[PDB]
Design a protein around this ligand. Structure first.
Ligand code: CLA
Ligand code: CLA
Ligand code: CLA
Ligand code: CLA
Ligand code: CLA
Ligand code: CLA
Ligand code: CLA
Ligand code: SQD
Ligand code: LHG
Ligand code: 8CT
Ligand code: PQN
Ligand code: SF4
Lengths: 731, 137, 107, 160, 42, 107, 30, 92
């Protein structure tokens, strides 16, 4: 056969395993037949071009559908009253009741209401008409085309890059810091000053107007005179109606701090100043490394030079330059870990400090965004650790890493793993024990016997930032502090106004329930890290299979000898962490959603009192809030939430289906499929047809993967339904 | 060589026997001499009666043939069992007692295949055999 | 079934705290705990736990002591048996508490 | 006082006490006086009142929920909430671990260590249990004499 | 008493059950005479 | 029809005395769902004295059974020819055990 | 508000991008 | 072992050290500067940076560009004194 053209070992398989494994190994270029390093890098380059094109097409489709089937123009008038519609529904399975139930957007056809916040995002950017969105979609289609053409072109013989080019670290770092990050954020500041702020003040400025419209009455004279403070004079009044000229100012760069009163989002002038500042900082940072001139550093020199003379790190960072440059898996792990941290940061900061107008009052949108980015964060972290393990299996050279930090990590992996295990057990034992103690006492009717620990440390941090709710008087809660006096005339007025009003999510008040759920989160993070770190460090070998690097990253097992060696691979560690990552992100999002739901209804006391025992979560969060969702459709009718109820049950179904692949293993199914093949061959009128691929059971690793995928899809879809439907049915 | 005229152990039939893959790809056979008419267990399932004299049996897999041989050797005391593989072309080949003596005891003439000149700890690393044709040995 | 039977009838057991059925509520939660705890044994294999035990035994040896009875992960069959036993105990106990609380509240 | 109010002077705590006592009294109103149920419910009421009074006088702080909250930061005014209790734990746990380790070594130097670990030598086990009361100085003595920490070259480890 | 019976009583599960029953009794009696101790009294 | 059957009482240690709910009849305990009260009513039991005698009979039979087990392992152990009597065992079970049991219960 | 001519221009750009995507897919499959 | 050679910038030297101090090639353009020069530079930079920072601690809406520039000498003084120590133990 020639389906897995990249593997004859699969092309010669006489079973369906060939098809399955050709699917699942299509992108492991390194393992493909006759794969050279130049071909590997060039294929990755072209694939990156294709991926960028796909992203551009996806965003273009979003814009096009909001422009065509959307209510953006009638949403920019009363954004706090009109629900934003994502796209129209055309399903030939809908009944008249369903069509009517989904015509909620005042559009006269069934629609979906967007939960992505693109409406608020674009309105803040400066989009006002549907023609603006359509032009954006046209440009993004053009950009997808350009990047597809670039990907095709750079696979041509005279345009294929070389490895001396792919491994050029200094020039790529300089260009990515200076141009991709720095000048890109500078251009975003330019957009925010030339379009977004005038649009937020009711002055339309576009391609036909931006070359004659001054972003500031003084023009660029304050810039080219050193009188930069003239760009902060006359900010927008507190009575500014976003999108209109009533209450607007003339400042383009400010550091007011806090939130705009009407929009309850950060000041656009503050955002513009932020982007300009980080742009110049990144431009400076992108001039650090040596390129075709004499100025700059060399990362190899720095890494080799950094060795503490005490010798507590050994050879320090010698050889890491070659290790990282020659291992794409090391780079992949670093990038994935950093992007995961940054997307968790995006979730956290985007709720505590909303940047888009009126997004804070879109409760379902905020919850959906937070859950989305937290789940993405967890996936990225799991992937980073998985690719670290893959690097250890494939790209690690001990002789090159003779007694540097990496070899030392491997040296004391036992200490690392054992202490990680101890801290996991510590956290788990005691957090679960406190929860059970509270459960039992409250059950016996003695809630006064609960162990409720005030999160005084986090409360102290809040007070240091300027929260006066808790009486600490530390740094910014103190009016006579040097920290207060230093920033009293820049941002502290607005920042204090934001922190000390209970109308926002900035530094929400916390209590013993928050303490307990935080330590549950600590347990989850530590146990996921335990599984992943153990997998990575034992990937090359353990005492059970001391030659694991020979077998690779994702082999099924080593047989029933030596006591049994099920799940003895680093892939299995990934497979096992993914359960735990899902658990932990579930805990995180449960906490976020319940706290915010209680605050939104104003009964924060419900969380403060029921968060201390697990029955409180099971009753006052899940059972209580599932009512509208499970009533999406019922014997007495249906509403728009029927889709979310159906998807809730869908997630339950696929979750339980994954249980099948995770509990039932291969031999049973193989001995059953044998009987099935016998029956087919022996049945008249159906033995006229024969399989071209011998029907076999699924492999061990394949079954683990399929069960994990079903489990994950059920997890995600069940919670997505619950969160969106409950938020939309409660508010 | 294999004589296709040897009688069979008067089996009563089963649904565990060979299938179309035996007629298309490979069909294994086992021949053995028995001193009396005993009852043995088919590797496919069920009981069969072996004859006094030579008995020929057809199976779909070499593992089935060798399991039957092990049963004969341990349960009974028959050790003259020979295993053959037959292709649709009529290319009957000889497999077990490959050299006429069972593999469990050394015999002069064999050549070592797959033997390595160190312990498993001396295997190279995939980083050392990456983008090269070297072998981890 | 999810709404009119499970969600509807679980109110008695989830609102049993402070009553004589608070034991049924607690057993409801504990049976949930054991049912979930079974999945650790059912979704997992022996190699991972033997390697984790190797690390823990290194920790114990670093303090110049370790049992003469060398610690081993559960056999494959025993891991399956433990997973099944905890699965059945948790599921049946959850139904036990649910049924008894509901019926003793409404009769 | 830290961020909360003393529990001895909180309307929420008083309301919780009142609710508990009223529940018990409603349960008591349906039982004859002097019967075992009446005596049991009366004792429950007395225990509830004593618990609430003792919590009030203990100096515990109580939040808006009306329940005592613990300040586990190190403040000496709230040491009895986490630190002294935790010192008692650490004492008992070090005792247990020290005596268990001693017994492991004792069984190690025996004819049948495995037999000693499944069928115990309870005279020696009780000996070690007794020894465990000065485990801190004993454990530090072991550490400094080098009998506690094993060398890196004498502990088995997997290949890299 | 028979030394074999004493060895049986010295077996691990018997000793674990007896010791943990003794500890449970210790905790139960401590809570029976000094109940509702959420804190060390200071 | 008014008092809930109960035959278990808990000790007042950690507030678990809440489980001694108001079952009825001036009695507070743990409601039981095994049907023993109805079994006894059908059997014609109308006193705690008769139930005490029932418990005594059960204890005596438990002692008899444990003694019989010890005796028939260590003192008089029947042989395989004794065990392999299917006809006799079925005759005796059917007639004696079952038939005489239901005859005595009918009486 | 979005006219059929506009939707048609969008479709034409989509078709061009599809052609380029097929080209890139071929070049990658090699 | 089949990995392509890693390209590094021009004039890339070996800076790895197990001696008491790095080789003074770590200091690049300032490799030939004297240890006394580094000491005086570090002291002057520390004083000037601290002064220019104090002149800007209660930041106004119109801070002085020269004070902003000079405040960056306090971080600079740290590297200067590290270089001073490196250059004292390398013979200079
Ligand atoms: C941008 C980042 C990135 C990149 C470039 C790579 C690249 C690679 N990864 Mg991956 N990886 C990533 C992120 C990344 N990974 C993340 C975030 C994780 C954590 C989840 C992993 C975890 C991971 C593992 C554990 C492994 C790889 C492997 C690989 C290599 C082979 C890929 C392969 O087999 O394709 C797979 C091809 C597919 C088509 C994927 C099929 C399954 C996906 C998940 C679809 C399931 C969803 C379903 C369709 C949705 C249904 C919807 C419902 C409504 C019906 C390749 C070098 C493998 C390898 O070669 O290692 C040596 C490997 O073992 N990766
Ligand atoms: C609710 C279910 C559950 C529970 C309780 C645990 C518990 C644990 N898992 Mg996890 N795990 C689960 C599901 C669960 N897992 C699932 C579904 C998977 C996917 C297969 C995994 C996969 C997994 C891996 C791969 C790893 C863990 C690890 C751990 C430990 C984490 C540290 C900790 O919390 O220690 C605290 C301990 C507990 C919370 C459990 C104690 C239970 C009770 C309260 C103790 C008292 C017992 C009581 C006296 C017994 C009386 C009964 C008797 C009479 C019969 C711990 C043993 C890690 C580990 O072992 O690190 C050390 C690890 O490597 N788990
Ligand atoms: C909800 C979870 C779940 C599901 C769906 C199944 C499904 C199945 N199990 Mg079970 N199984 C489960 C959990 C589950 N299991 C667990 C947790 C375990 C571990 C203990 C097992 C262990 C196990 C064993 C050991 C065996 C089974 C068997 C079966 C089969 C029963 C008969 C059958 O084929 O029915 C078919 C019906 C369904 C699969 C229900 C869903 C189908 C819907 C109604 C139709 C949807 C089709 C749709 C149009 C497709 C469109 C695709 C595209 C256009 C979008 C079936 C495949 C037995 C078997 O295969 O015997 C024949 C068997 O031997 N299971
Ligand atoms: C997470 C960080 C953290 C840590 C690790 C600690 C640690 C400590 N805090 Mg705490 N604390 C923190 C955050 C933290 N705090 C925060 C954020 C706040 C404000 C909300 C407080 C407020 C606070 C107060 C008000 C006090 C402490 C005190 C203490 C110390 C108590 C024990 C002691 O004094 O031993 C001293 C005893 C010995 C060294 C040996 C004793 C020998 C024999 C056995 C007796 C301890 C070092 C107390 C203290 O005095 O700290 C210095 C104290 O009064 N803390
Ligand atoms: C009634 C309350 C209560 C209960 C039921 C438990 C129950 C438990 N605790 Mg404890 N604990 C409590 C209160 C309680 N704790 C309090 C108030 C504190 C704060 C001081 C702690 C602090 C604590 C720690 C620090 C640890 C536990 C651990 C444990 C678990 C195992 C203990 C063990 O095996 O001992 C038998 C003793 C041994 C096996 C010997 C070795 C372990 C002990 C604890 C060492 C003690 C001496 C050592 C020098 C202390 C250094 C501590 C430092 C590194 C922080 C067990 C579930 C352990 C755990 O979860 O491990 C995963 C553990 O390490 N607890
Ligand atoms: C360990 C398992 C177990 C447990 C804990 C219980 C528990 C219970 N059973 Mg029992 N039961 C079990 C297994 C178990 N059963 C099995 C396997 C069977 C089928 C044979 C029965 C059949 C059964 C019946 C028919 C009745 C109970 C009843 C009861 C309850 C009262 C206890 C009592 O003394 O009844 C005493 C039992 C009786 C007075 C009725 C006896 C009548 C049967 C027909 C006698 C059969 C005896 C015969 C030698 C068995 C072998 C038959 C075989 C050769 C064909 C209680 C909840 C009673 C109940 O629910 O009361 C409200 C009840 O009526 N059970
Ligand atoms: C093993 C069961 C059993 C036993 C020990 C007895 C015992 C007795 N029966 Mg009998 N009896 C039985 C079953 C039994 N009966 C059954 C199943 C029936 C229904 C046919 C009767 C119907 C019956 C009657 C109608 C009478 C007795 C009577 C008697 C007494 C005199 C004989 C004696 C107490 C006589 C008596 O004095 O009754 C109080 C009497 O008149 N029995
Ligand atoms: C409230 C009440 C608390 C206050 C009461 C204070 C009395 C504490 C007594 C502690 C004690 O007796 O330790 C007995 C231990 C014996 O340890 C043993 O010492 C042994 C050697 S030898 O005993 O030192 O000869 C050694 O092998 C063994 O491992 C070790 O455990 O003595 C020592 O080892 C050192 C004692 C520390 C001396 C400084 C204390 C100053 C005060
Ligand atoms: C304002 C900004 C200031 C910078 C702050 C950033 C952190 C500083 C780093 C400190 C790390 C500290 C640290 O991790 O040091 C680690 C240090 C690493 O040394 P190296 O191995 O690089 O070199 C040591 C060799 O020079 C000796 O052969 O090793 C030491 O232990 C040596 C002594 C450290 C210095 C001892 C300091 C003693 C402090 C005195 C007690 C004062 C508090 C009481 C009052
Ligand atoms: C700046 C500031 C503001 C407010 C006050 C505050 C004190 C917070 C102060 C300081 C903040 C600081 C210091 C924040 C610290 C954050 C840090 C250190 C975050 C780091 C997170 C680390 C992560 C994920 C690491 C993940 C690691 C992974 C995958 C490793 C994978 C790998 C493996 C397993 C094998 C080898 C290869 C590779 C890729 C390395
Ligand atoms: C967690 C886990 C382990 C590790 C668990 C172990 C080694 C169990 C050891 C537990 C201790 C020794 C039991 C005693 C402590 C318990 C709290 C008491 C209850 C147990 C008794 C009632 C028997 C495996 O070894 C394993 C093996 C194969 C498949 C899955 C798994 C698996 O999931
Ligand atoms: S069970 Fe499946 S996986 Fe575990 S060892 Fe046996 S074969 Fe390998």
């Amino acid at each position: 056969t020639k389906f897995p053209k990249f593997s004859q070992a699969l092309a010669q398989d006489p079973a369906t395993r060939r098809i399955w494994y050709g699917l699942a190994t299509a992108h492991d270029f390194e393992s493909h037949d006759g794969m050279t390093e130049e071909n590997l890098y060039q294929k990755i380059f072209a694939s990156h071009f294709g991926h960028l094109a796909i992203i551009f097409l996806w965003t273009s489709g979003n814009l096009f559908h909001v422009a065509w089937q959307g209510n953006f123009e009638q949403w920019v008038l009363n954004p706090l009253k009109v629900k934003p519609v994502a796209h129209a529904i055309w399903d030939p399975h809908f009944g008249q009741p369903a069509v009517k139930a989904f015509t909620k957007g005042g559009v006269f056809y069934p629609v979906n209401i967007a939960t992505s916040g693109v409406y608020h995002w674009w309105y803040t950017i400066g989009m006002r008409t549907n023609n603006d969105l359509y032009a954006g979609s046209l440009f993004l289609l053009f950009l997808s085309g350009v990047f597809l053409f670039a990907g095709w072109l750079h696979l041509q013989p005279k345009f294929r890059p070389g490895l001396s080019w792919f491994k050029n670290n200094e020039s790529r770092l300089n260009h990515h810091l200076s141009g991709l990050f720095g000048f890109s954020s500078l251009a975003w500041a330019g957009h925010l000053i030339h379009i977004a702020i005038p649009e937020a003040r009711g002055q339309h400025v576009g391609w036909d107007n931006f070359t004659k419209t001054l972003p500031h009455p003084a023009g660029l004279t304050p810039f080219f005179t050193g009188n930069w403070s003239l760009y902060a004079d006359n900010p927008d009044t507190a009575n500014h109606i976003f999108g209109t000229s009533e209450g607007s100012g003339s400042a383009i760069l400010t550091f007011l701090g806090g939130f705009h009163p009407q929009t309850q989002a950060l000041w656009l002038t503050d955002i513009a100043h932020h982007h300009l500042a980080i742009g110049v900082v990144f431009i400076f940072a992108g001039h650090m490394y040596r390129t075709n001139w004499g100025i700059g550093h060399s990362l190899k020199e720095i890494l080799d030079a950094h060795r503490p003379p005490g010798g507590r790190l050994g050879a320090g960072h010698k050889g890491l330059f070659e290790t990282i440059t020659n291992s794409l898996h090391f780079q992949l792990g670093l990038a994935l870990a950093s992007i995961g941290v940054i997307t968790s940061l995006v979730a956290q900061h985007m709720y505590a400090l909303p940047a888009y107008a009126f997004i804070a009052k879109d409760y379902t949108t905020q919850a959906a965004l937070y859950t989305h980015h937290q789940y993405i964060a967890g996936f990225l972290m799991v992937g980073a650790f998985a690719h670290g393990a893959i690097f250890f299996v494939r790209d690690y050279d001990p002789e090159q890493n003779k007694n540097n930090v990496l070899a030392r990590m491997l040296e004391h992996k036992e200490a690392i793993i054992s202490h990680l295990s101890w801290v996991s057990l510590f956290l788990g034992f005691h957090t679960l024990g406190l929860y059970i103690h509270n459960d039992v006492v409250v059950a016996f009717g003695t809630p006064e016997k609960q162990i409720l620990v005030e999160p005084v440390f986090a409360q102290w941090i809040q007070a240091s930032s300027g929260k006066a709710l808790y009486g600490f008087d530390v740094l910014l809660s103190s009016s006579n502090s040097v920290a207060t006096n230093a920033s009293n005339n820049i941002w502290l007025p607005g920042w204090l106004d934001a922190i000390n009003s209970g109308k926002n999510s900035l530094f929400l008040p916390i209590g013993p329930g928050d303490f307990l759920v935080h330590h549950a989160i600590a347990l989850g993070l530590h146990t996921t890290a335990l599984i992943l770190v153990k997998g990575a460090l034992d990937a090359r070998g353990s005492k059970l299979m001391p030659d694991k690097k020979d077998f690779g990253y994702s082999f099924p097992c080593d047989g029933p000898g030596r006591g049994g060696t099920c799940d003895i691979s680093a892939w299995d560690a990934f497979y096992l962490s993914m359960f735990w990552m899902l658990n932990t992100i579930g805990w995180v999002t449960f906490y976020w959603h319940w706290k915010h739901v209680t605050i939104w209804q104003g009964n924060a006391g419900q969380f403060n009192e029921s968060s201390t025992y697990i029955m409180g979560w099971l009753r006052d969060y899940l059972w209580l809030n599932s009512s509208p969702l499970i009533n999406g459709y019922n014997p007495f009718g249906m509403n728009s939430l029927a889709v979310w109820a159906w998807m809730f049950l869908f997630g339950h179904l696929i979750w339980a289906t994954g249980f099948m692949f995770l509990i039932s293993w291969r031999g049973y199914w193989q001995e059953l499929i044998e009987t099935l093949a016998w029956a087919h061959e022996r049945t008249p009128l159906a033995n006229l047809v024969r399989w071209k691929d011998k029907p076999v059971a699924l492999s061990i690793v394949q079954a683990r993967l399929v069960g994990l995928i079903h489990f994950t899809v059920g997890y995600v879809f069940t919670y997505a339904a619950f969160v969106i439907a409950s938020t939309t049915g409660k508010f | 060589t294999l004589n296709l005229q040897i009688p069979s152990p008067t089996f009563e039939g089963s649904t565990g026997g060979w299938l179309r893959a035996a007629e298309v790809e490979e069909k294994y056979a086992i021949t053995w001499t028995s001193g009396k008419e005993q009852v043995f267990e088919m590797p496919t399932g069920g009981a069969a009666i072996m004859r006094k004299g030579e008995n020929l049996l057809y199976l779909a897999r070499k593992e089935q043939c060798l399991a039957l041989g092990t049963q004969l050797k341990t349960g009974f005391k028959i050790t003259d069992y020979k295993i053959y593989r037959i292709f649709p072309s009529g290319e009957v080949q000889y497999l077990h007692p490959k050299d006429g003596v069972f593999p469990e005891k050394v015999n002069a003439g064999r050549i070592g295949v797959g033997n390595v000149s160190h312990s498993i700890g001396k295997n190279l690393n995939p980083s050392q055999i990456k983008f090269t044709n070297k072998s981890f040995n | 079934w999810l709404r009119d039977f499970l969600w509807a009838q679980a109110s008695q057991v989830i609102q049993s705290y402070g009553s004589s059925l608070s034991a049924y509520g607690l057993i409801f939660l504990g049976a949930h705990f054991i049912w979930a705890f079974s999945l650790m044994f059912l979704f997992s294999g022996r190699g991972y736990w033997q390697e984790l035990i190797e690390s823990v035994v290194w920790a114990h040896n670093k303090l110049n002591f370790a049992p003469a009875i060398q610690p081993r992960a559960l056999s494959i069959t025993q891991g399956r048996a433990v997973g099944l036993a905890h699965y059945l105990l948790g599921g049946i106990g959850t139904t036990w508490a649910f049924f008894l609380a509901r019926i003793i509240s409404v009769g | 006082v830290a961020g909360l109010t003393p529990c001895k002077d909180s309307k929420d705590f008083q309301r919780r006490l009142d609710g508990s006592v009223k529940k018990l009294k409603t349960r008591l109103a349906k039982y004859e006086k002097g019967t075992p149920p009446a005596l049991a419910l009366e004792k429950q009421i007395e225990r509830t009142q004593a618990r609430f009074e003792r919590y009030g006088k203990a100096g515990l702080l109580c939040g808006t929920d009306g329940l005592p909250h613990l300040i586990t930061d190190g403040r000496w005014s709230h040491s009895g909430e986490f630190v002294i209790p935790g010192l008692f734990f650490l004492y008992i746990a070090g005792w247990i671990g020290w005596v268990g380790r001693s017994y492991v070594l004792f069984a190690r130097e025996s004819d049948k260590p495995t037999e000693k670990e499944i069928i115990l030598d309870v005279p020696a086990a009780l000996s070690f249990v007794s020894t465990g009361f000065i485990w801190p100085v004993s454990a530090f003595k072991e550490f400094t004499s080098g009998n506690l920490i094993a060398d890196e070259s004498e502990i088995t480890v997997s290949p890299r | 008493m028979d030394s074999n019976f004493l060895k049986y009583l010295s077996t691990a599960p018997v000793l674990l059950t007896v010791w943990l029953s003794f500890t449970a009794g210790l905790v139960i009696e401590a809570n029976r005479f000094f109940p509702d101790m959420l804190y060390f009294p200071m | 029809t008014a008092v809930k059957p109960s035959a278990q009482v808990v000790w007042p240690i950690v507030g678990q005395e809440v489980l001694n709910g108001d079952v009825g009849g001036g009695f507070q305990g743990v409601q039981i769902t095994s049907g023993f009260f109805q079994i006894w009513r059908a059997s014609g039991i109308t006193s705690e004295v008769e139930l005490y005698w029932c418990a005594l009979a059960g204890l005596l039979m438990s002692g008899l059974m444990i003694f019989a087990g010890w005796f028939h392992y260590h003192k008089a152990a029947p042989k395989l020819e004794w065990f392999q009597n299917a006809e006799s065992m079925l005759n005796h079970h059917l007639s004696g055990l079952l038939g005489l049991g239901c005859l005595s219960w009918a009486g | 508000m979005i006219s059929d001519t506009q939707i048609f221009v969008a479709l034409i750009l989509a078709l061009v991008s599809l052609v380029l995507a097929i080209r890139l897919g071929t070049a990658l499959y090699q | 072992a089949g990995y392509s050679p890693v390209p590094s910038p021009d004039n890339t030297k070996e800076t790895y050290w197990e001696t008491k101090a790095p080789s003074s090639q770590v200091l690049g353009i300032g490799k030939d500067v004297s240890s006394g020069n580094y000491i005086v530079a570090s002291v002057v930079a520390a004083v000037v940076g601290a002064a220019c920072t104090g002149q800007c601690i209660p930041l106004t809406v119109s801070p002085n560009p020269v004070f902003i520039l000079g405040s960056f000498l306090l971080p600079y003084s740290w590297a200067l004194h590290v270089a001073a120590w490196i250059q004292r133990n390398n013979g200079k």
